[PDB]
Design a protein around this ligand. Structure first.
Ligand SMILES: Nc1ccn([C@@H]2O[C@H](COP(=O)(O)OP(=O)(O)OP(=O)(O)O)[C@@H](O)[C@H]2O)c(=O)n1
Ligand SMILES: Nc1ccn([C@@H]2O[C@H](COP(=O)(O)OP(=O)(O)OP(=O)(O)O)[C@@H](O)[C@H]2O)c(=O)n1
Ligand SMILES: Nc1ccn([C@@H]2O[C@H](COP(=O)(O)OP(=O)(O)OP(=O)(O)O)[C@@H](O)[C@H]2O)c(=O)n1
Ligand SMILES: Nc1ccn([C@@H]2O[C@H](COP(=O)(O)OP(=O)(O)OP(=O)(O)O)[C@@H](O)[C@H]2O)c(=O)n1
Ligand SMILES: Nc1ccn([C@@H]2O[C@H](COP(=O)(O)OP(=O)(O)OP(=O)(O)O)[C@@H](O)[C@H]2O)c(=O)n1
Ligand SMILES: Nc1ccn([C@@H]2O[C@H](COP(=O)(O)OP(=O)(O)OP(=O)(O)O)[C@@H](O)[C@H]2O)c(=O)n1
Ligand SMILES: [Mg+2]
Ligand SMILES: [Mg+2]
Ligand SMILES: [Mg+2]
Ligand SMILES: [Mg+2]
Ligand SMILES: [Mg+2]
Ligand SMILES: [Mg+2]
Lengths: 559, 559, 559
């Protein structure tokens, strides 16, 4: 086993999550079975209690574990599947050892937070890094630990102590620390004193740093690096600069130009880890897929405009997984992406009574879009705008994907505007009216990776061509409310055909509309399973249809 | 006595010197006899050893004390005269107490740096703040101490201890601390953790802060101030923001909008200091002169271009006092200033053999200028360019001021190009040739405020009109080399008339050329004596002649 | 080259000087040419200005450098000769670099205390550790640096930074840090939190510790060591305990039982240093001399009582070198030592008018003594008591040594009480009387190691037998006042024979009285040249005469 801990910061907004998700990617190019752990200093047990307004979207794992965003960034960069244990939190570990007290397992000793709770952290990291994460049950070679918060805090405090002991309870040369740090620029001069005042605290809290990964606004001066290597004890080759480049998928290749694999190969003796040619050649091939997709980003010019239609579009992190899946689908089509933020409530005609500028800008963005996405919203208060965009996408022939709530407004749209029931309703919203035309029903939660089976006649469905025509699809779910299955025999007659269903047959999970270029609902969330080299099939479908050449993508899949 | 200490910083480049020079200005509007002290953590005794390349120009005081730049900023903002004791340094105080050891004055005790050296600091600040600084020998009401370096360093260390004792050895309510601090902005969010990691160190080193003067890139958010007032113990009204505004002469009036006089009047009980109406009404009148000159800057549009002709123009701080004196002269003329940086060596014809672009850009800037300045350079290696600009200024009639070396190249120019001795030379440069046409001689140093007497016939001289026709002028000097007095009887015959001389008659200190709109040499430095409401008379002459209306300025002076 | 820095402390009184003087002794048993450096955070240039009341005696080096006590402890433990450069001080290094500024050697840069002054420290330690110190001009293999003050102070601050850079400017594995630390005991429990709050500061200031040398009141518990090895990163074998044992000459052998040579041999790779058999066998022989002299201390029982007669005897550190030389002489005679503190002014008959108890206790202690010492006092105010003890020692036949002032009161005693001039006087005291019987004269200072030549007839003198009958003696001096050489021809006739003189013949440096068992004056200081295995010959003479068997010691010397 080996560990690399990514850590530090003068400030908590500094962006450690790319250097974690990008260090682990570079180590996966050596062919190593890499894994990752997030530490979050917040008290939440797991993210399911905190709304998407409050620091971004509610992620989903194979377990159903509603979790921190930063798990998702490692899953999509590293190709790995994570579990709800990979998110260490102050909530979890304190709830764990305090529940263990009432169980009695410390034999009625004191449960001081030094010794015993820092021992539970060091045990949890050693459990979790041995859980398998790739397509086979082989245990990881290297674990990337992202230490949330900063080193020099009061929510960080048990973790930085636990990791001082863990620098020895796992031997040095099986552990390395990467310290992210701030180097401000003021009046044209690079200021390395915030960094030198977090190297003092790092040595004090007891870890010793290996890298000094500065988030400067610039290239670091040769004299700036020379002084950081005088005040921190690292050699000047190790003072990596992580400055902005044309997209975040380039960041691994900047770190590779900055020798970071050659340093980590030495500093953790990675030549002593046992690897097969099936490991190593997969490693060096994955490097060439990353060099190819970044070269394709560097000279892709032909734009594709996708309208993302929903509430809270000013909080873009409320959709981080939706955005990132369109970026994967974009780079695979070799069309450059623009996403058009349509704040759905502005499409509703009553907006014309409040501000006409909002009513025109939103319908302008929607009309300009080469493809349309209803992105699995939350709450109900924007729903009429999401219905109008689904009417537009059906009648104007524009490519369409409905995710989760998106499948459900598509059934509501089709009921109101093709089946001809204008009172038909989201039972998710208009409940205590008790009306008969209910497009949905509550069936109290359903979460995690679940099996979707294709219905028998489905051969013609573009969505089934995009899934490689395989009879079953494994994808991640969230929904309380599902389509009322007593309308399905009507929709099945009117050309709205339910391509895919749950294994009991009673629950509807995919539809495709007959006789449209690409119009799909998926009631699972296709966002979360997308990887940077394997875009999620419904999202690859959307960005292909909107680019043209949907047929040529269907060959690239099925060959 | 009262003290305000201006201090702090996450980073040393943060710009405390304006908040010091601008806090003391606001207190002078209450009519208080304000003084100021600079602390510089460097080991230099005094600045005379360190070249103008190395952190800016070599200042001069009335004593001849070659000193830190930051004395100058208080002198010109506050109208005060300082002495070489007002610059506390690590060099000075350690040289003082270690020389005092060999003298024996600690009675053969140990001279630990705690107790005894921190007692010498607390004694020095109490000596120095009682030295008089205004036009009358009245001792100061309030002293502004600017603590150089940062609070949380190893060159700062005896000063922050000395000032912890000084918070009591002078009572609280006779002392206040203003902590300047950094609040970075990253991804659009204001980051108050560098500030909260210098409030921790401040409390630790033992001073307690009063103000939290942030150097953010923005207006501070109401929520940013509320959190800084939660982690520092100041109330939110006291978290002053010191953001950029149209010129640094506005900064006092931003601090006045941010209640800083109303706070300091309370927090130091300044109503208990005895003031006359001659103090108070001078105070409130000086406020209206500052409101008037800042209002004049806000709608002055008519440009005046002054060529500053010399070496090292890329190091603008090598001329900070020259620049600032032109800004005072500008605002008094009500013309907006552009200074044209002419790197003098580019005017020399040999530059045409090296790069024609440099030869044209430099002569273009010089030809475009409404007035010309030879700014008292250092060394000799650009001198031929400074001679060509003096030839141009004489023959093309353009307004001219030569400061120090500027008077001397004007005599060399006039000798080569009007008297007709083309071999005549700077004895400052071409020494061991031993030639007879020496325009200068060494007479080993001459420094500080000295008396210049006008020669008898001088009545017609525009420079004597600008000095109010008063028979003697008191101004600050630096020169090893002076005009060879055996050429003067020739220049006096050719219309180059030496308007002013030293009290012995043997040394030449001012000239004005007959029959030119404004062409002056001054061998003293007129820069250093300029105040923000009293621009230095030769520099007011230059910016007036270049603006036109030199006659109207001569009425504004003599009425 | 190799360095071991001895450092640290929660408190400054903790006793680092034995662990320094005893680590270097253990390394000298490997045969290495060891040297040592003292750092003193005080501002004194050198100790000559600070009186023996103020933190102990005024030491003397071969240079004449009046220096810190702690040089002496290394000289006598390690056999080495030091120079006044081996005492780094805050006074010296700041006086050095600030004098270097007025000389100009930083080329007119800023002389910040970071970079430039910490570079002067790192240069000074690298100069000084290459100066030779043994009987041949071979440069040292290992240097012990004793860091005075504590790590976590403001007088320490440039040294701990300089030593962070010096951990790299000399490579790791050529440097090691030993951190002395406090482990209090309260209510019967060992408290390792003062230690854990100086390991935090050590890591912060940037050095990393190797040893954790606790000054507990007890043996450290196995659980106390296990927790210190959990919070500091050292392994539990390295947490040395330095508790009290029967004399400080045992301390090296406790550290040798605690593996400290086996650890330092590994941690500095001391097997790679080139050694001859003449080095190594001298090393292992010196170990057996230390095992022998400590075994002799463990079962020596026969007491010898030496009266030390002088002022300020309550300040025993005012005589630290005098005490330590008697301990060497004691262990060489194999008699256990008691020193009788005679506060000399109490022997004066006027004390009988003030307190009879003082008059009896002091004469009781003097009468009880097996031998008598006048220990080179300072000032004059106790002199009549020192004369009465010299009268007693001459007439009652008791063994006597006069050091410096001791030789001079012996001449004054002999003049008043054998030559018969009762008005004869110390010209050091009774000056402006201008009397003719002056026993002394001023000849303005005379310091350092000087050559003493024996006068021709001297063969019979016990002092010349103790010096091995060698014609010249090299020993360290301090005296303004010396015996008036115009009395010598009288004393030479009366049996007070001047055995030794300065090379000019004009100055008198040793006498021995004819026809007494052992009665010696030495006007040099014999204390400072004594080593733990080579006691100073006059002091070996005194403790031998007082033990009996002075003849048997004269064989042990001359064989
Ligand atoms: N490989 C990555 C990593 C991060 N991000 C972006 O980074 C964001 C949030 O910043 P991040 O780098 O994850 O760190 P912070 O949120 O600043 O938090 P912390 O510094 O506490 O880890 C999201 O907007 C996401 O789009 C990204 O686009 N690609
Ligand atoms: N740990 C440190 C670093 C620097 N200094 C001193 O503080 C002065 C001012 O600090 P600065 O020169 O700004 O050093 P930097 O570390 O570069 O600060 P910044 O990065 O903000 O420019 C330096 O000249 C130096 O003498 C200090 O006392 N302690
Ligand atoms: N009233 C003021 C104060 C400062 N400056 C400008 O500020 C400069 C240098 O910055 P300063 O504010 O004096 O502080 P720093 O040099 O950053 O140093 P420190 O923060 O260590 O005090 C010069 O360029 C000067 O033109 C100015 O124009 N007007
Ligand atoms: N002294 C502090 C301040 C904050 N926190 C914790 O650290 C987390 C991340 O710090 P941050 O939210 O960034 O707080 P700020 O002080 O604003 O940091 P910055 O100014 O850099 O944004 C906070 O949610 C809080 O729980 C802490 O442990 N100790
Ligand atoms: N080998 C040694 C070392 C020290 N001492 C005794 O130790 C004394 C002073 O304490 P020391 O151990 O030298 O250290 P401190 O004075 O406590 O100072 P510091 O801890 O600052 O080094 C003297 O009384 C001296 O007799 C000794 O007898 N033998
Ligand atoms: N660095 C540390 C060490 C201990 N503790 C906590 O503080 C409690 C009380 O400290 P103590 O048990 O006394 O630990 P020691 O380090 O042994 O303190 P001392 O040596 O003074 O007994 C411990 O139970 C532990 O939970 C802590 O918070 N931080
Ligand atoms: Mg925050
Ligand atoms: Mg993050
Ligand atoms: Mg700097
Ligand atoms: Mg400044
Ligand atoms: Mg003390
Ligand atoms: Mg000591």
């Amino acid at each position: 086993m080996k560990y690399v801990v990514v850590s530090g910061g003068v400030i908590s907004g500094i962006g450690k999550g790319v250097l974690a998700s990008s260090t682990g990617m570079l180590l996966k190019t050596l062919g190593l079975k890499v894994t990752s752990i997030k530490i979050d200093p917040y008290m939440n047990i797991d993210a399911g209690t905190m709304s998407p307004l409050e620091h971004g979207e509610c992620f989903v794992l194979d377990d159903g574990g509603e979790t921190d965003l930063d798990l998702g960034n490692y899953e999509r960069y590293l190709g790995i599947t994570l579990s709800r244990d990979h998110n260490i939190t102050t909530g979890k570990i304190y709830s764990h050892v305090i529940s263990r007290e009432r169980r009695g397992d410390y034999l009625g000793k004191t449960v001081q937070i030094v010794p015993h709770l820092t021992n539970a952290i060091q045990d949890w990291i050693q459990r979790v890094s041995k859980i398998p994460v790739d397509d086979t049950g082989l245990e990881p070679d290297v674990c990337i630990i992202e230490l949330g918060g900063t080193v020099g805090d009061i929510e960080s405090a048990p973790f930085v102590e636990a990791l001082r002991q863990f620098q020895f309870e796992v031997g040095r040369e099986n552990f390395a620390l990467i310290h992210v740090s701030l180097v401000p620029v003021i009046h044209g001069e690079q200021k390395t004193k915030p960094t030198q005042a977090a190297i003092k605290d790092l040595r004090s809290l007891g870890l010793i740093p290996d890298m000094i990964a500065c988030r400067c606004s610039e290239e670091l001066n040769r004299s700036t690096i020379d002084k950081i290597a005088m005040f921190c004890h690292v050699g000047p080759e190790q003072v990596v600069n992580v400055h902005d480049v044309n997209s975040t998928y380039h960041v691994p290749l900047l770190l590779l130009k900055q020798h970071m694999i050659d340093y980590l190969h030495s500093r953790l003796k990675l030549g002593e880890v046992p690897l097969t040619l099936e490991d190593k050649e997969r490693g060096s091939q994955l490097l060439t897929n990353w060099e190819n997709m970044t070269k394709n980003l560097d000279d892709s010019d032909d734009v594709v405009k996708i309208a993302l239609v929903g509430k809270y579009t000013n909080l873009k992190d409320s959709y981080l997984s939706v955005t990132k899946s369109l970026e994967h689908a974009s780079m695979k089509c070799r069309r450059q992406l623009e996403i058009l933020w349509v704040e759905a409530s502005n499409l509703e005609p009553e907006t014309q009574e409040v501000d006409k500028n909002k009513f025109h800008d939103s319908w302008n963005k929607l009309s300009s879009a080469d493809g349309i996405l209803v992105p699995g919203g939350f709450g109900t208060r924007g729903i009429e705008g999401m219905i109008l965009a689904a009417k537009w996408a059906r009648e104007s022939g524009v490519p369409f994907l409905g995710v989760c709530l998106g499948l459900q407004v598509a059934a509501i749209e089709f009921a109101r505007n093709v089946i001809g029931r204008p009172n038909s309703s989201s039972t998710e919203f208009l409940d205590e009216t008790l009306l008969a035309p209910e497009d949905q029903v509550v069936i109290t939660m359903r979460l995690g990776l679940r099996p979707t089976i294709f219905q028998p006649n489905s051969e013609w469905s573009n969505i089934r061509k995009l899934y490689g025509e395989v009879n079953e699809v494994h994808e991640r779910h969230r929904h309380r409310y599902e389509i009322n299955p007593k309308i399905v025999n009507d929709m099945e007659s009117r050309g709205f055909i339910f391509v895919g269903k749950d294994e009991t047959g009673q629950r509807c999970e995919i539809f495709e509309l007959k006789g449209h270029p690409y119009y799909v609902g998926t009631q699972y969330h296709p966002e979360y399973t997308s990887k940077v080299l394997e875009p999620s099939r419904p999202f690859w479908g959307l960005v292909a249809a909107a680019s043209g050449t949907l047929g040529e993508v269907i060959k690239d899949i099925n060959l």
